[PDB]
Amino acid sequence: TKADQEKLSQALARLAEEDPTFRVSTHPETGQTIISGMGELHLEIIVDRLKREFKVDANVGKPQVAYRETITKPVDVEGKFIRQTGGRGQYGHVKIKVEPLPRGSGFEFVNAIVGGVIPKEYIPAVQKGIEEAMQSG
Amino acid sequence: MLTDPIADMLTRIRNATRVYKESTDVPASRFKEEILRILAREGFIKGYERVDVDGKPYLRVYLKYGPRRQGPDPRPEQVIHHIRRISKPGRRVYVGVKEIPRVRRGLGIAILSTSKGVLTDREARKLGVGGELICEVW
Amino acid sequence: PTINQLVRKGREKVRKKSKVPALKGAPFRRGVCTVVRTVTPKKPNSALRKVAKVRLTSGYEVTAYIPGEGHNLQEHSVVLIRGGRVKDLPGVRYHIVRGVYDAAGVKDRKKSRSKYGTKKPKEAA
RNA sequence: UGAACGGCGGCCGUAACUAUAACGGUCCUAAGGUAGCGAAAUUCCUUGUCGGGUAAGUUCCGACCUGCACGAAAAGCGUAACG
RNA sequence: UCCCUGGGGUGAUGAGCUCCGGGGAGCCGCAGUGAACAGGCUCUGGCGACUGUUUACCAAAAACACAGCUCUCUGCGAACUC
RNA sequence: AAGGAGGUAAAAAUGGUAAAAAA
RNA sequence: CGCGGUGAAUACGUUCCCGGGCCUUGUACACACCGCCCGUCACGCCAUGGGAGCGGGCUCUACCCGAAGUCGCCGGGAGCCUACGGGCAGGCGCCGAGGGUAGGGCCCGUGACUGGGGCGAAGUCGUAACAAGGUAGCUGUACCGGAAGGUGCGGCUGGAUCACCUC
RNA sequence: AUGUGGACCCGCCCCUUGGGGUGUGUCCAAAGGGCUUUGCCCGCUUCCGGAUGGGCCCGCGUCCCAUCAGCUAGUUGGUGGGGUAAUGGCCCACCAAGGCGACGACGGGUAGCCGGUCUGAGAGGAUGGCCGGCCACAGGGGCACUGAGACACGGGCCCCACUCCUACGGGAGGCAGCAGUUAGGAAUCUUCCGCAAUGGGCGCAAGCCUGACGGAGCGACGCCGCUUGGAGGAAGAAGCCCUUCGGGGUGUAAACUCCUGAACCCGGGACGAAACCCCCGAGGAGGGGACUGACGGUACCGGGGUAAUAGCGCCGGCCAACUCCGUGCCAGCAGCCGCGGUAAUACGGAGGGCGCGAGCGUUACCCGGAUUCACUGGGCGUAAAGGGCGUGUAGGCGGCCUGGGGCGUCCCAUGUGAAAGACCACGGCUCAACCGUGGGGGAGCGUGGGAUACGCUCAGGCUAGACGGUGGGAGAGGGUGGUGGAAUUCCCGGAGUAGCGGUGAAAUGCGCAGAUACCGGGAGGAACGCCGAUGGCGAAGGCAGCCACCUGGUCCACCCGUGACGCUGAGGCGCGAAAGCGUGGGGAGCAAACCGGAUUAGAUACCCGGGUAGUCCACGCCCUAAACGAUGCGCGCUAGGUCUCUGGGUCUCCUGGGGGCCGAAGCUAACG
């Protein structure tokens, strides 16, 4: 439990302050602070000193990876929000074509109005929910 | 009934002084005689006497006023501005020498009952004897 | 309450509550931390403000803020538990300081260098 | 006429992450299980999922409830005293 | 064991005889209700409320009983029952 | 017939409509 | 759009339909009824009560063992001084810190699960309250309902006016 | 042994808690050392008196939670013992039931207390570190010993941990003394010098220990003083900010000018300390000479002389100070309100200016503004708040008058309140911060006398309060038994037939199996029409046909009685709408829950047909509210107009008690 964690952070508070060397830095995309250093036996024996005289229960795990994702094809669907409620509606039928491109480009969308349908207030917002429904695949 | 005919008197005073009625009555007692004595003795009331009503001893007091001004209504001003009972039957004040009020920083009067009789502020101060702080008037 | 009743009972004194229990008479505590996030103030805002959880050196998980623009902090820093909420982050009590054991203020600051780290802009000219 | 024998549904959708469904639709019948209790002397999957208890716990107490197939006098619930 | 002593009884308001009792010191062993009769205790569930009754010859039980409750039949030649 | 006040009888088929905001 | 030949009916009345104006009035409304506004159920955050119990701090009593020491007594078939009377060493006995056992009492930490409360640019459902809010409101209550709420018995105005009996 | 004396014992005189003497009988002493020796110095023995500190005791004040209400069998008391310097159960024994508590006991959280300290006009709040007094602790606990004094920080014994030394047989140690390490925390220092000065312990002295004390070091932690410069110096250069291209600003600020002269160089150089000491006298008073500095050659005096550090909060109103670009509800500031959502005086930058300056902001803690726990100094008709209403205990307080008391209170004498600080005054260091010295104010309790006005105490008295007597009087004021009619559903009877019912409309419903409607008699319950009201009674909740019984509340007249019997009343007491509950009786009407009907998207609701609990009785329990005059009770006072119910009077009027409205003054923030 992460209660023993900030505890082991005091442990580091006298580990990364006695031997310079190592870097106790946390990966962003995942939890758990990465104990980085220069040596196999290095981290191993520093780990010895842990359960020895600092006594920490941490099933010493494998480092995680920063996983992203994408697609591989042109898709066309109906984003119709045909939903009236109280009378205020809030309904949105959006018609997107989606195109995918190289592993390394960036992010692209286009000021793509078929002529002049969807309001210009959605131009800097209809794409948000696109960029929003993108933080989780 | 009553719990301080004294205060009820000072009250009837306030009554007459406010409602403007040349005189008003208030029952017989030595202490009130002493009080009204002080009042007349310092240019406040208009006088007193040992009267009777229905066969019951009373003490009536006539009281002072001033001139009739114009403009803001005819109401003539008051001389006996206000009085407040200080040493209530729960506020049993016991002033003395170094103590004693200075009533409206100069004028006024501290009515106080002391070892030797009923003295006023300048009086009881001069006498160098204190006691209970009856009321305040100006 | 006629003098009597006031004499018997009394009139109980105000008594505070300390609307900032960093406690110990200690208002500077050694902010460990965990989590960063963002959160927002009421109706017309949206920002960052951390949550630094600190542990002080005697308890409490707080929600340590920061001195605003220009942070690094990662996850230790010794965020100096300070004290003072605002209409934002339902807490903002016990802030962070920069300089402390981490942060040292905005990369280039010209005023609030009393918290915002930066020493004396000695532009060498 | 139900402290008379009895019986006391199903499917479709819907909460601005998700999951849920107070909520609308909908065929059926006489009517669709109210309160309380619930892996029960009732639970098939089951040694359910959780918590405690233990060195370890299909047993046990407590709790969650998709009750295969609790539930109103073939009574429901709970209860100190006896067994 | 020994010293001190209280009241019920009987006789008389006591000697004797009896009943039940209190205190203080002192003696011995492994332990003194010295042997025989003589209860293990507590926590928490389940069902049944309760003492009970029942399958003599495998059952004692959560089954039946029970005080209590509703429901109904009975106008005296009762109704019920043979 | 004046007002003001005190106790008795009257009169709405239905209505859901949001909101950060602009001075 | 403008201009002209001919040439009416009928308005008693304000009973009811439409609206405006003004006054009154009600008000929890204030780019103000195209206003506000409550309660579940929903997502998250924060303490909190409860909860089979676990953890622990203090303290409570009854009892078992019991150091040092004070005190009390003995010094006996014996030890040493004895200035024999005693003394000292020692012997047993009282209180006694401490630990032990069982049962309390109080407090905090706490835990599957569970009630509720707060909060958070806009969720879903209904519209109760504020104009008689479209059923006068509001409450004590007892039964009911998705939820705000409903309703009987009662009470209370902070409820009700063509015009009915007075001041 | 010697015995002025002290100690006990039994008497005795005086006392009055164990104060002093005294008659009888027994016990105790002594240490000697020095030398200038026949004398003294230092010490010794026995007691008395002071000087000085403490022991015990009471008086008194002394945080909070009432969701801490009862506590106690060494417990309250005695006699008789034991012990201490000694009073006392502090402990033994024996014994009689008492000992404290809403004046907050018991419990438990919290805490050293003070002379003082910061703030507020003050009341007071909070506070107690350096210093000065009293307490308590010695790693925790027990514990004695020694002794004039202890339960003894660097003495002893034991248990407990805890750490260390060893050859693992055994043993040691306490920095809450002083410097210094470490854990701890945002943070609290030198492992220093001298006993020269003072002070303590000892020695006849010389002298000796003294991390007491007296000095330097470190940290802007506090307060004080102080240099970075003076003086000339431009319609004002340029450098940079701003612009309407004219300039405005920055700023005499700069530079150039002359002047002085921190730092620093040489020289001399302190006070802080004269006693102790030897010497004449006697070892006394007095007299003389001589020794004695850690700081440090620092202070300071003289001369030579260099211009020689500048920062920190801010510029949206509180709060003094705005212009320019960027940033665009993003990055962000914020103690309050809030400010930015693409021209921000609040972000962020740059010029300027506000503040302060060897310092400024930030947070935390404390007092104030906060009169926002109100004693000065508040409030309860609608903002927060009358207890649903009467009862009564204690408690609180109290009518007119005489005199005694002299408790509260007032007066002056007076003890102490140390010192220090607080104030003024004088002074010391060249000022201040800071320290030297004088004096008064000073709460407060002790003791003396004095006043008696006011509360209270004491005795006597009065009638104006309270109460009683008699006599009339009003009422839906309660407990009980009794009885009248109307009217609703229902039973038998009779007569009649095409519908009624019900509603916004309708329908569920009842109807040719003879209903709704009317006539005859019987059942049965519950509520009282008109009167009757804007009224009456009642402490509130309540009370409604009328008879009778018992029975409280109150009203006026008469002045007949008593003589302050008084107002309120924390708890305790009783009471109580409707609902609701229990054990029984009863049910006409009524009606939630429940069913049907209509209605609407929905109708678990209002509207319609049914129907139950219940609404009734006795008895018991619950005891709640918009119990609403939302206004506690009791007294007296301050205009009157009017509507009315009741009491008395020869009465187109008065007067007592009540019930509505109006409106003086007066009150309110206003409606009122």
Side-chain angles (χ1 to χ4, degrees):
Chain A
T1 68
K2 304 189 179 185
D4 302 27
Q5 190 275 312
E6 320 196 26
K7 188 181 181 303
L8 83 82
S9 296
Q10 224 166 83
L12 103 85
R14 247 161 306 97
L15 260 41
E17 294 182 13
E18 183 175 26
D19 183 22
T21 64
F22 61 86
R23 330 290 166 82
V24 211
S25 56
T26 311
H27 194 249
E29 313 303 314
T30 182
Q32 62 192 30
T33 307
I34 308 171
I35 176 60
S36 171
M38 30 136 275
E40 211 242 10
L41 81 172
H42 182 188
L43 278 65
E44 166 112 307
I45 69 182
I46 301 306
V47 157
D48 155 72
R49 288 275 293 186
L50 259 48
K51 305 169 182 301
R52 258 266 216 82
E53 270 67 50
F54 293 90
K55 185 152 53 265
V56 184
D57 265 34
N59 317 27
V60 202
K62 70 165 191 181
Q64 260 298 275
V65 193
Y67 308 105
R68 311 281 171 81
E69 66 253 31
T70 167
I71 73 283
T72 15
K73 83 155 304 187
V75 184
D76 282 74
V77 293
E78 160 196 312
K80 209 168 193 180
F81 197 65
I82 29 184
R83 327 248 84 192
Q84 299 296 338
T85 315
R88 52 270 202 183
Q90 246 72 309
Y91 105 99
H93 179 186
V94 85
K95 272 174 174 166
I96 84 287
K97 185 176 179 181
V98 293
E99 186 160 329
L101 236 71
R103 297 175 176 172
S105 294
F107 193 55
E108 296 177 326
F109 119 99
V110 273
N111 189 267
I113 359 178
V114 67
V117 198
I118 281 184
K120 308 160 272 71
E121 57 180 272
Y122 303 149
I123 302 178
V126 78
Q127 189 208 358
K128 232 85 173 191
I130 294 175
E131 302 175 357
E132 194 155 83
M134 202 203 69
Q135 318 300 329
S136 305
Chain B
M1 213 293 280
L2 310 177
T3 40
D4 199 48
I6 297 90
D8 201 351
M9 169 199 39
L10 322 169
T11 309
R12 299 154 178 132
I13 303 308
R14 300 172 204 185
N15 283 99
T17 67
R18 212 55 48 178
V19 192
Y20 284 3
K21 225 144 295 295
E22 191 191 32
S23 63
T24 178
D25 192 2
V26 61
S29 69
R30 296 174 318 280
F31 216 33
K32 286 193 286 191
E33 173 193 300
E34 302 271 23
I35 298 309
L36 318 167
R37 152 199 140 77
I38 309 300
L39 271 307
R41 219 194 51 145
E42 293 294 339
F44 250 54
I45 61 182
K46 197 180 189 175
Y48 73 141
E49 81 289 319
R50 290 180 181 173
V51 270
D52 195 333
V53 183
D54 291 42
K56 316 284 179 290
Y58 271 85
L59 222 179
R60 187 192 266 90
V61 182
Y62 313 177
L63 34 281
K64 197 196 295 185
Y65 304 93
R68 167 199 186 277
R69 344 132 301 141
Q70 277 200 355
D73 118 273
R75 179 183 324 280
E77 213 208 84
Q78 182 67 18
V79 187
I80 312 97
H81 280 338
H82 220 338
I83 172 169
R84 175 177 57 169
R85 186 72 173 95
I86 294 299
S87 174
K88 320 171 193 306
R91 274 292 210 183
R92 356 288 323 260
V93 181
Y94 289 128
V95 257
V97 50
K98 37 165 185 176
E99 314 88 305
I100 281 181
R102 304 88 58 197
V103 215
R104 209 93 163 197
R105 207 62 196 183
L107 45 146
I109 172 184
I111 358 279
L112 61 146
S113 152
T114 85
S115 62
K116 291 135 208 77
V118 180
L119 324 174
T120 97
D121 39 337
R122 311 167 182 179
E123 301 275 0
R125 183 170 310 204
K126 131 190 174 177
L127 269 308
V129 292
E132 190 212 306
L133 212 159
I134 313 174
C135 36
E136 62 83 45
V137 203
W138 28 240
Chain C
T2 64
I3 185 160
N4 165 279
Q5 321 188 345
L6 286 173
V7 165
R8 306 181 314 148
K9 284 188 177 183
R11 281 181 171 174
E12 214 176 17
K13 185 183 176 179
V14 274
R15 191 221 300 186
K16 38 268 174 183
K17 82 168 187 180
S18 167
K19 202 179 169 59
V20 264
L23 300 170
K24 193 184 185 170
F28 288 115
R29 245 106 99 90
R30 227 140 62 152
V32 171
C33 173
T34 161
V35 190
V36 172
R37 211 176 282 97
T38 163
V39 212
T40 142
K42 283 307 128 71
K43 271 66 184 174
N45 307 82
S46 291
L48 67 177
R49 285 74 229 258
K50 280 80 264 147
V51 261
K53 285 198 172 60
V54 171
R55 254 41 156 83
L56 290 283
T57 16
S58 53
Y60 293 79
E61 268 212 334
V62 308
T63 16
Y65 166 36
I66 30 137
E69 199 200 47
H71 95 81
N72 31 286
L73 328 180
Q74 48 177 328
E75 196 245 283
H76 269 346
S77 293
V78 169
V79 312
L80 232 47
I81 267 343
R82 179 159 81 106
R85 69 150 69 227
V86 274
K87 265 116 192 75
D88 332 28
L89 65 162
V92 226
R93 35 221 310 179
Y94 328 113
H95 306 159
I96 308 197
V97 170
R98 342 265 276 293
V100 208
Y101 302 29
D102 162 79
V106 203
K107 278 195 174 183
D108 182 24
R109 172 69 202 191
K110 293 275 187 172
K111 229 53 173 196
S112 338
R113 301 184 303 261
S114 308
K115 311 181 193 70
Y116 306 9
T118 302
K119 290 299 218 173
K120 202 58 217 170
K122 188 185 182 298
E123 28 55 73

